[PDB]
Amino acid sequence: CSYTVSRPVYSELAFQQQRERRLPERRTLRDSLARSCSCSRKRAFGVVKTLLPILDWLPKYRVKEWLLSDIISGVSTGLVGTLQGMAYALLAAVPVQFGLYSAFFPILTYFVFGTSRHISVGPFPVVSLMVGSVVLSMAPDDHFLVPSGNGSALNSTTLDTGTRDAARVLLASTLTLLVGIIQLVFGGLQIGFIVRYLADPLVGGFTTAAAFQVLVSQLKIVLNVSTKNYNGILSIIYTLIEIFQNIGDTNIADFIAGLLTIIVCMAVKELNDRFKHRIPVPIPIEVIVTIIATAISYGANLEKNYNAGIVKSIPSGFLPPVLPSVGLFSDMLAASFSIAVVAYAIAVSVGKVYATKHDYVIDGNQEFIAFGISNVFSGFFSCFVATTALSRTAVQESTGGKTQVAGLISAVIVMVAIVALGRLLEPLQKSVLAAVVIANLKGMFMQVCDVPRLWKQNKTDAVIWVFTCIMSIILGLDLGLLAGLLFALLTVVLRVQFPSWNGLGSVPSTDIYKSITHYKNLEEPEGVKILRFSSPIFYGNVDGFKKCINSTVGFDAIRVYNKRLKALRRIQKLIKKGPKVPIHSLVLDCGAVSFLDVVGVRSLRMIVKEFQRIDVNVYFALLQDDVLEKMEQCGFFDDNIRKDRFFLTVHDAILHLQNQVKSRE
Amino acid sequence: CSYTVSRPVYSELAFQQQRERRLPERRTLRDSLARSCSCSRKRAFGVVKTLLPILDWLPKYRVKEWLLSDIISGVSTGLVGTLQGMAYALLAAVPVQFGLYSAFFPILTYFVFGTSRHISVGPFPVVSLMVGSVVLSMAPDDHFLVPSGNGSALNSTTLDTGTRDAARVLLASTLTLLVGIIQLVFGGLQIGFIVRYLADPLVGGFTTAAAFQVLVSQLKIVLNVSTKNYNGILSIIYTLIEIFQNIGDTNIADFIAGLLTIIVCMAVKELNDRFKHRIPVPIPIEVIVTIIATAISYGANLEKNYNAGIVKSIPSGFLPPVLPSVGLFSDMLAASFSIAVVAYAIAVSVGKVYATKHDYVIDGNQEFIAFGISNVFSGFFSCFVATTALSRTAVQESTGGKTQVAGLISAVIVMVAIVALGRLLEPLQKSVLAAVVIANLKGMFMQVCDVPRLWKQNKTDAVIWVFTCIMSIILGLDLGLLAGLLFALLTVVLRVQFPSWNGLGSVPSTDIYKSITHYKNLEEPEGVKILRFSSPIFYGNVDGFKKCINSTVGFDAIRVYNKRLKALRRIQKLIKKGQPKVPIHSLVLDCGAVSFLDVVGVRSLRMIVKEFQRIDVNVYFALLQDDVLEKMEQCGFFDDNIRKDRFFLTVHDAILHLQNQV
């Protein structure tokens, strides 16, 4: 239809006179905290069901086919998880048994406190890399070597194989306990807005840099070289240079086997991902490649005849729980916070993906509490921080998963592979386990293809991705996240400090105002210059507003007044002996403002007063109600600056100006 | 007065089909790189005029209240400048001989280059310890340590003199020159937007603990409490408790001397403010309490008969310029960057605290090159850094003062005090001049009265003011402004992340849409609701924008879809076996106050439209003027079905569209 209205010009005061405002509710802090404290059984049952979601999906089971679905998904997920754990155990500088330990206890702890259905809690390459890095920084290799072995010239300060692994495991357990404590603190205090700052490009660049560092570390492990655990600034570049300079001390057989298994696994994964319509169940290439590697490595003495690198350090048993060594929290609090926040970000991402894929809800604070409790329980049993891997979660989702019971069954596989099974994997080469990690890096390596897409989009979003990826390589990986979040906040501040001001004008015989820099056939009021200023004025962008006003009016309220004062004294001396031509009004269309930052309202009142001396009226067009209520308390409506200066709509100001010009020449 | 705005409802595609756009100018730098100043002499004369801020106020001052006012004010800050030069020089582990030069030469080059009044360039308390820190690190205390002097048992390892202090001044001279050239090279690329981040409560909360820092630094000299040097964290607390712990060895004669002078100097100060209409010219009590103190000290010998503490070490005569060591600039370069940044912060912070009481707003780019060449001019003469003390700028502004010429005449007082008035201020008790800074310090101590004022105006800046005040006490003045600057920017990103979202509603028989939580007797369209976020949808408020919708519509778009298919699968199996939705039709997001969008926002906003589309509830939008509209279509917001027809120019056009549709 059509749009036509008829109403008087209610600028600021003609609207608030016949409009009874809504009185705010009484605070009553005592009764507020008293009423908020729930005591009925309904709220108690609700918070119990929320805190322990296990009692929710259990009574409504569909055992009939869910039993078989969960048992097959559980055996598949258990195989995949024990393989990923025995692969990532090298990234934590701990023996291979602790990876399987951390692949068993966190699942049992999440089964009774989790709220998702497809999230496979377990090891993660990025988290394991960060744990290994902080362990090497806190416990280097050259800090445990013992002189023994009757050396030739000096004391035989060989490796400390033995008690060194116990110290590393205790350090990892303390780190996991601190991470769990930090996560529980973030969850219980309802502080969950801190993880909102991890933007999608930021986390993408961080995952890309972490995958690059994981590739570097796995190539170091495959080549079987001896580095000096370079950590700190340019650690990845320095260790890559050291690898390139230490090529001579490699293993040709291990390198050939690693390249072969890498090619095979990549080809099989690509074939399964591309031709999915012909094979419904993904072929567990990891399982078969591990089986064939253990079979080939057992036939011949690859440890003696080829000098390969195997584990051969599997005790095949459990251990009583050990209390963590408290006292190292002050020097690892930042690392624990970084690990916790990156793990929570990755977990929330995976959960949202697999939830919008299956159309169910996942709570954030509940997942935070669940991961915190899981890490706390793992810290008491010599385990590292657990997360959800994209590759491990994809297998459980492809095999068919409904509830966390498949995860409970997934622990049974690791369970039987810890107590009795496991010693058969003795001659397995470490390069084989170090290869599947590289093969799983294809997902995060293809994330670089977004920069050509993001560059065509908003350019500031692409700068954050490149900055996060590059900075997380120079000053390590842990400090790179802190340098990325601050950079993202600074980029946000830059977008609100430099707004997009225009020359808003009116279309002929209309009421809507559009910009003049993007249109040609627009009419402007005679003398009146309209200006719109988004990105509300604060202490940092007030000079920007001054410059924008000076540019849109053509002159300066200071220089014109100084010239007027200089010409005024010339008149008083001549009688004793014997610029602002086109500008008529200035309508500020501050309709996109949210806050005011009274430090800036001072300069706004200063501008209004300065333009009054040069007889140039400066009005307002579309100020919000809350903004005006805030400016009223900030001391802006004095005896001269009344409410008639403000307006409700942009057209009302122009209409009032036209009426005043017609009625007063 | 009524007005006829009869016009059919216009959407985006219905408004761009009859109008025309404008070709945006790319403005490539391959041919437009010489458009700033090629041959026009007007632009050349402009940059020279701004480069020399001497042709602006000097040919413009009025001599009515200029001659007598600035002279009596110059000697006031000139006397204080002499004490700071004689005090801060000892703390820098260098001989106390060049303190007077740092207040004479840098003022001359700043008198012509630099437009910032009420500032006395010279040494600063917290910057003198930083110089003494880097000197003792890269230079041992004993250079040669000649073991001679026929000691008790072994050779008397006497500390070498003459050559030791000469190298210390040479090292300090190279440091000031290295900071100067670094201070000047920053002005090349014109980084002057950093001063815009220093808010009035930021500099107000900063120049209130520094007034407390300069209070405790002047309290240990007025009480003669030998305390150790402390810097970094808890510097003010450790020095405060040391005075109270070492209060025993306090000069009783010097205590009653300073206590009697601090009262009489502040009493006459407020008396001049009360009788300012009677006596036109303010009485310079600073020069009065100075000459009477030398009389009671020289006529009674307060040093050798009362042990009160005097200067008694005033040098005489200038020194020729000495060339620095270029081969040592590489070592000080790693440490001068930290000192150069904190110097410029304190230098401009004392200019903004006085910019609120007088309309003298300055620019950071001009002050960066002004103080830059001043420290360069400070070089080659073995001077100190060209900072500005907080005590000298207070005694000049509170006790009169019109322009920067008060610093020029102050150097003249220092000029005659070194060549002809050296023996004059010899018995100065170092108390009447170390406590006179406390009298003029009330101008900054009374600045804490804005806490109840700012709290009633806006809660955010009130927290910023008290935060920077308490943080500068613990983390010191060095990291205090740095931590407060990040906290000030944090309040900007928080206010833009959690806006004041409210549901809007029209007024009867009109098209004005205002908030319903602040007004009454409003009405809402049956089945159509209005939501105004009034904030940009960036990566931080992505879920906050979702929580704003589900809390306003009553339901949650996520839980109504899974329960819909749950009931759908429930009734489906019953057919083979045998047999809370709000009536709101659509919602119009009044997201007109958005200023920018990101890739996370355009993706999340697309998911919201697709989410409500599956629930048979449409979602419409509001005015996206120039940027937030073109950015969405560039990020791939319209793929197959979502079109620009769902948008609207005005909020009322959205209501009229849903009205005639049903």
Residue numbers in the entry:
A (entry chain A): 18 to 595, 651 to 737
B (entry chain B): 18 to 596, 651 to 733
What does the original paper state about this entry?
Similarly, the pendrin sample in the anion pair of Cl−/I− (1:3) (pendrin-Cl/I) was prepared and used for structure determination. Symmetric inward-open and asymmetric homodimers were observed with approximate percentage of 75 and 25%, respectively. After superimposing all structures we resolved, we found very little difference among inward-open structures or among outward-open structures, respectively, with root mean squared deviation (RMSD) no more than 0.5 Å. The asymmetric homodimer consists of one inward-facing protomer and the other outward-facing protomer, representing coincident uptake and secretion- a unique state of pendrin as an electroneutral exchanger. Considering the significant cross-section area increase from inward-open state to outward-open state, we hypothesize that when one protomer is outward-open, the other one would be inward-open to minimize their effects on the outer leaflet. Therefore, the coincidence of secretion and uptake in this asymmetric homodimer shapes the molecular basis of the electroneutral exchange of pendrin with an inverted alternate-access mechanism.
